[PDB]
Design a protein around this ligand. Sequence first.
Ligand SMILES: Nc1ncnc2c1ncn2[C@@H]1O[C@H](COP(=O)(O)OP(N)(=O)O)[C@@H](O)[C@H]1O
Ligand SMILES: Nc1ncnc2c1ncn2[C@@H]1O[C@H](COP(=O)(O)OP(N)(=O)O)[C@@H](O)[C@H]1O
Lengths: 218, 234
Amino acid sequence: QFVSNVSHELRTPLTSLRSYIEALSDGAWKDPEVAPGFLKVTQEETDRMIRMINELLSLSTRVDMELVNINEMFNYVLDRFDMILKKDDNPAKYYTIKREFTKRDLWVEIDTDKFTQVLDNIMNNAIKYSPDGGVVTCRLLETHNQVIISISDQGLGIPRADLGHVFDRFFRVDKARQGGTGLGLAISKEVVQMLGGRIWVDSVEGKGSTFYISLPYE
Amino acid sequence: VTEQQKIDNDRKQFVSNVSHELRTPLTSLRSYIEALSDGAWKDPEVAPGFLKVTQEETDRMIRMINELLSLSRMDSGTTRVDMELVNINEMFNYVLDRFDMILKKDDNPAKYYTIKREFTKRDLWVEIDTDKFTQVLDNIMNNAIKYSPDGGVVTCRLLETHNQVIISISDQGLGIPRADLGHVFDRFFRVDKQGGTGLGLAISKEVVQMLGGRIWVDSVEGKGSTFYISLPYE
Ligand SMILES: Nc1ncnc2c1ncn2[C@@H]1O[C@H](COP(=O)(O)OP(N)(=O)O)[C@@H](O)[C@H]1O
Ligand SMILES: Nc1ncnc2c1ncn2[C@@H]1O[C@H](COP(=O)(O)OP(N)(=O)O)[C@@H](O)[C@H]1O
């Protein structure tokens, strides 16, 4: 349903917007080296949220495939999550984003808005389900004519019995450790399949998780 | 026929409203961010003032999102309701204690108010979900204070009948038009035209209904209002 999806999907961009506005208010507005770049991101997130409301309201049409540089696009996503982490209430370096991208530029046909939603949910999960903190490792590679993204955490894991169930709508693992609706990964799977790709997960209950996304390369 | 239709119409309206209400702050943000990007950011007389407004608009949307999410969770049957036997007197008194304590600090207070308590003497043990019900009392108490005249008295009652536990919360503010006594519990209904979503009482009505109870309001314009909560007793 519309309300539930739009509400769920606005949360990461609102957090990201809040985070950059906070950095600006805290003094970055005085720094000519960074203020314009920060303002540019808030302008982009605000416009993205406005498109998102409309898109999701209309579905109750466009899957807009563009040839995109995944390297840059993934990098832009992770830049926001670093900003969320720095303006976080946690101690500095309580969470780390380590990037492991191949050096060649990878061009892939995607819907930029919808796929950002996918990366947002997985990064946000990777953080939300590491309460004790940790490194989030983000990999970008091409092999066997697939472009593959994997996102690993050192968080709470996922029971083996539930590895399949986690992409189902409303499914939330019911053990100790919060969350919300159980929609993020179902929305994500829907987008990834729509784009001709695949998503899957490996996990160890005490160690952490790795989510994988595969997209057709050429 | 009409039954399914009324439902579908309410849903269609609610969706339309959600889209308009999320859109309006974002549109306001866009306008302040664009002024900032066009150069106001270099200007110390306005950049801080402008940033502050974007921060407030952003907070309002995050509250709206959280509120819309609870409404969804309940609409889904997904919402966890944990009925436990608790002392309503001590729970209500603690709620009022948080509000008295707010006033105890010189802000300066914008407005002074008094919280008058009239509780029954016997202890009322009743099964409820404390986390959710405290939220309900908060929403009514915040309204009661917000719409009180300077120096107004907020009167809080806990009384039981043979069949019911009744809580009432009265203010001496401008009250509510008779045409609207029902509508104030509607999603996004605000009689007025700053922050405030118009979802609080909609959440409250839904929560009180999950708990097996009833909530309603009496008001005489210019007199003030009295909100009631009824809970099944024993
Ligand atoms: N990175 C992760 N580590 C451990 N558990 C995770 C995880 N990412 C997702 N999960 C689990 O999968 C369930 C469903 O995820 P999701 O669709 O994104 O739900 P959500 N967080 O939007 O409420 C979550 O409730 C959580 O139990
Ligand atoms: N105690 C009260 N006195 C006068 N009007 C009241 C009132 N409590 C609620 N109302 C009216 O009902 C409307 C909706 O209440 P509510 O759902 O709590 O709004 P809110 N606080 O989330 O923005 C308010 O805007 C107000 O017009």
